[PDB]
Amino acid sequence: DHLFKVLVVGDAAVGKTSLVQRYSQDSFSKHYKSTVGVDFALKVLQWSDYEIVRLQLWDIAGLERFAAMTRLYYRDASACVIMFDVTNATTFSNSQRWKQDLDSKLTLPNGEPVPCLLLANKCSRDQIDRFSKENGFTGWTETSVKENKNINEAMRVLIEKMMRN
Amino acid sequence: IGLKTLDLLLTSGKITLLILDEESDIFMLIFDAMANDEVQKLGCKALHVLFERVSEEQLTEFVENKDYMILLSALTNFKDEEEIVLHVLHCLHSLAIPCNNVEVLMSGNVRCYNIVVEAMKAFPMSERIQEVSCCLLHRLTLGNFFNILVLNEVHEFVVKAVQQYPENAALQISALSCLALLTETIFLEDKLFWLEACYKALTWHRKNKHVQEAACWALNNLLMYQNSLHEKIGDEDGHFPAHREVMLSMLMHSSSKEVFQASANALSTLLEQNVNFRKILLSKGIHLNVLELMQKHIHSPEVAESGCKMLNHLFEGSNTSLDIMAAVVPKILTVMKRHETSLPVQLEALRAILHFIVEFHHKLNMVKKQCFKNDIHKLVLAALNRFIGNPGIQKCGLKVISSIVHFPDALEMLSLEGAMDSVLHTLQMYPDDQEIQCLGLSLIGYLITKKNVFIGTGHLLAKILVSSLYRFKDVAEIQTKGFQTILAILKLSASFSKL
Amino acid sequence: PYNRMKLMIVGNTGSGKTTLLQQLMKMQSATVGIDVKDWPIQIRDKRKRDLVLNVWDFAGREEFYSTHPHFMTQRALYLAVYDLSKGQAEVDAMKPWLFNIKARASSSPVILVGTHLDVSDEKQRK
Ligand SMILES: Nc1nc2c(ncn2[C@@H]2O[C@H](COP(=O)(O)OP(=O)(O)O)[C@@H](O)[C@H]2O)c(=O)[nH]1
Numbered sequence A: 001d002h003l004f005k006v007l008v009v010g011d012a013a014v015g016k017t018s019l020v021q022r023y024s025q026d027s028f029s030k031h032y033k034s035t036v037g038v039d040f041a042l043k044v045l046q047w048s049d050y051e052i053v054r055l056q057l058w059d060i061a062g063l064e065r066f067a068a069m070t071r072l073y074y075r076d077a078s079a080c081v082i083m084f085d086v087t088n089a090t091t092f093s094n095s096q097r098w099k100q101d102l103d104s105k106l107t108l109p110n111g112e113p114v115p116c117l118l119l120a121n122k123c124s125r126d127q128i129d130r131f132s133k134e135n136g137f138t139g140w141t142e143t144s145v146k147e148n149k150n151i152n153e154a155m156r157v158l159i160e161k162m163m164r165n
Numbered sequence B: 001i002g003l004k005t006l007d008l009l010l011t012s013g014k015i016t017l018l019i020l021d022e023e024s025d026i027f028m029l030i031f032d033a034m035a036n037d038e039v040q041k042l043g044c045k046a047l048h049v050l051f052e053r054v055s056e057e058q059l060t061e062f063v064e065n066k067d068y069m070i071l072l073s074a075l076t077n078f079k080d081e082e083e084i085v086l087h088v089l090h091c092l093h094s095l096a097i098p099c100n101n102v103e104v105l106m107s108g109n110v111r112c113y114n115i116v117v118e119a120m121k122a123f124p125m126s127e128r129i130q131e132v133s134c135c136l137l138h139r140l141t142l143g144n145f146f147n148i149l150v151l152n153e154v155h156e157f158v159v160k161a162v163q164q165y166p167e168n169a170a171l172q173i174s175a176l177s178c179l180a181l182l183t184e185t186i187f188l189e190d191k192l193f194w195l196e197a198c199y200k201a202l203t204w205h206r207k208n209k210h211v212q213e214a215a216c217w218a219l220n221n222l223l224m225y226q227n228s229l230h231e232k233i234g235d236e237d238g239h240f241p242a243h244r245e246v247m248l249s250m251l252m253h254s255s256s257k258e259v260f261q262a263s264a265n266a267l268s269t270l271l272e273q274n275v276n277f278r279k280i281l282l283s284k285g286i287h288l289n290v291l292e293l294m295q296k297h298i299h300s301p302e303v304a305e306s307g308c309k310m311l312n313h314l315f316e317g318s319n320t321s322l323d324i325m326a327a328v329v330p331k332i333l334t335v336m337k338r339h340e341t342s343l344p345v346q347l348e349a350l351r352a353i354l355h356f357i358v359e360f361h362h363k364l365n366m367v368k369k370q371c372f373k374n375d376i377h378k379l380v381l382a383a384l385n386r387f388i389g390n391p392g393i394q395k396c397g398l399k400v401i402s403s404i405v406h407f408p409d410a411l412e413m414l415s416l417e418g419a420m421d422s423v424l425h426t427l428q429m430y431p432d433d434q435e436i437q438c439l440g441l442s443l444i445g446y447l448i449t450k451k452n453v454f455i456g457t458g459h460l461l462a463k464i465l466v467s468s469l470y471r472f473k474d475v476a477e478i479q480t481k482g483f484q485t486i487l488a489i490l491k492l493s494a495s496f497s498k499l
Numbered sequence C: 001p002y003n004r005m006k007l008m009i010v011g012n013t014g015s016g017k018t019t020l021l022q023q024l025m026k027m028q029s030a031t032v033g034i035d036v037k038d039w040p041i042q043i044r045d046k047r048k049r050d051l052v053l054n055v056w057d058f059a060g061r062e063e064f065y066s067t068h069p070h071f072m073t074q075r076a077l078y079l080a081v082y083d084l085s086k087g088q089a090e091v092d093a094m095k096p097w098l099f100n101i102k103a104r105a106s107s108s109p110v111i112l113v114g115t116h117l118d119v120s121d122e123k124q125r126k
Helices: A016-023 A089-104 A125-134 A150-164 B001-010 B016-020 B025-031 B047-052 B054-080 B082-097 B110-122 B127-139 B147-165 B169-187 B190-204 B209-225 B243-254 B255-272 B288-294 B301-314 B322-338 B344-356 B360-373 B375-387 B389-404 B411-416 B418-429 B434-447 B451-457 B457-471 B474-494 C017-025 C090-094 C094-102
Strands: A003-009 A039-048 A051-059 A079-087 A117-121 A139-142 C004-010 C034-041 C051-058 C074-082
Touching: A003 A016, A003 A089, A003 B288, A016 A051, A016 A117, A039 A150, A039 B243, A051 A150, A051 C094, A079 A089, A079 A150, A079 B169, A117 A125, A117 A150, A125 A139, A139 A150, B016 B047, B025 B047, B025 B054, B047 B054, B047 B082, B054 B082, B054 B110, B082 B110, B082 B127, B082 C090, B110 B127, B110 B147, B127 B169, B147 B169, B147 B190, B169 B190, B169 B209, B190 B209, B190 B243, B209 B255, B243 B255, B243 B288, B255 B301, B288 B301, B288 B322, B288 B344, B301 B322, B301 B344, B322 B344, B322 B360, B322 B375, B344 B375, B344 B389, B360 B375, B375 B389, B375 B411, B375 B418, B375 C017, B389 B411, B389 B418, B389 B434, B411 B418, B411 B434, B418 B434, B434 B457, B434 B474, B457 B474, C004 C017, C017 C034, C017 C051, C074 C094, C090 C094
Parallel strands: A003 A051, A003 A079, A079 A117, A117 A139, C004 C051, C004 C074
Antiparallel strands: A039 A051, C034 C051
């Protein structure tokens, strides 16, 4: 039995709740709306026999991007994911801003930054390759929120990467 | 000019201690200074700055003299003067710190009328004056708060103050704490604005522990005394989404036990109010989460009690899986074991265990064996044996044992621990209660062994059985259980019939 | 260090013990039993540590004399207020007090403060 907390960050109106409802409540696409406040979801994964892991997904509201991101959101947080809409370079710049803020406001018992996943929602991989190699993130994966084509494999890879540490 | 120079000098700091260590009685100087109106305001009312350090008895003498002088001068000159009224009120705040002086300040309810008038007229749209007066309101709360009309007036004033200045932490803490205490007082329209203020307090002050604790305490106490608006909270439009805010506050400030207690009590009252919120918090993953929080906070009994109350009100009326059982029951067992003397913690843990305990068969057998290996029987027997009062824990313990007995391995450990003597003693001390008698009479036949009636000795058994059956002769269930128990006993030894 | 001491004021009735205590420290029909008070004396100089004299104003009427020696102890200072308007019999009247003071506290300061001198003559004083 183990507990982990994953913080989902990104821009606004980019389906931040879409990925977490597809991953936990098994709902894809649907109407896209704005997130009033921080919301929570529970995921249960049977990664190994007699070893059950629980995941708490926190999908932080991106409306307060200019606001000072409180360290209490990231306090005791174990893992993170960055999700950006692939139809705007402004979303890419926002994801850069979130990654920089996280690198400025995160700590670990070992001191190394928590694993990060660059998720391209609502699917130009060559353009993203430069930042994939430059930012030093754990991995990069594209997916579509409406189709849920690659969310499961990406999250499984992220959980395995976390359990490697 | 002397007062002005003294006031600007005392802003430097590290000199007020030197001034108080003088010999010319600067206190008496300021008292003798005051009908100038410009004076006293000129004095800068640094009496409050001095009242920061004045020693309580010296402060009480200061209280008689200052109440007289300040009340008269302040009322006139300051009814016309924001600074004078503010300074007099904050000096009264510094003066009212000792617990003995509150009755002095309420000798003729002059302080209450003064603060009410100041809130009404002195500061219609002023922040610092309202903050000081509201701090007075919070400080002036005790067992002597049965001032009905004054209570209504001050409640209206503080509520108006919250809706007119919700962006500062000076008001929200004191206002919401006094608001909770006074709503507990008076409740023996308003609710919409009250929860609006509470929701704004939770949302706009997420980083301040005290504001969140006070606001969720106010929400809890209001919902406790007002159950009609349980449907007025929710994610649907027209309802304040306070449940997520309470959870978020609890999680950000898990290091603080006070916010945990207040938030857990608040959402426990909310869950008891309406059952629709249950199975939604479970979907949010809070049960094992609050279990982890109690694991972090184990040195205190209040945090464990509040968490057990949350579990009791969260898992009521629902059925979980074996994984949830294996993840929940050991934590509650550890919490009960570490806290063996606290009556509320034991009662809440027993209630939670009772409400939660009752391919697939093998897994459940494994869960039962793990629970048995966690020394559940010893803990529950110790809890219900050491604490012979508070019959509720007795009912919970008998129910838990009744659920325990039909486990695969229950009989041997139950007999070794000596549960039978505990059951017999419980029946002896509670002759008149019905549920205890029914549960005990059903249980006795279940845990009876040949050792308990060895060599024909079983007189307390017969005495208790006959007494229980005779006292409740018309209750069909009690008689049925008693006669089944008697037949079970006779199946072992026939000599018992003689007894 | 502990700056605390008991001060005892004794004498016959009408001597002026209560009035003397009021004058020094700052409806006196009688002082029934013993009046216990605390005298906070912080000398104006900060060098002198603040004393708290435990004042025990004793009765003057003879009905209370039986229980007085139980509360007379060492580690205390004694006053001996004697009226001057009465004449010279006050000296005789204070002998029982001095006897009990000596019996209970052999080594303790004794101060004899003749009061009500505003009416007394110098021959009586001598
Ligand atoms: N002769 C005289 N007596 C005074 C004067 N002022 C006060 N007294 C009396 O002195 C008494 C105090 O003596 P005290 O030792 O307290 O007597 P006790 O109360 O009987 O033990 C008071 O009861 C006063 O009535 C004064 O100016 N002249």
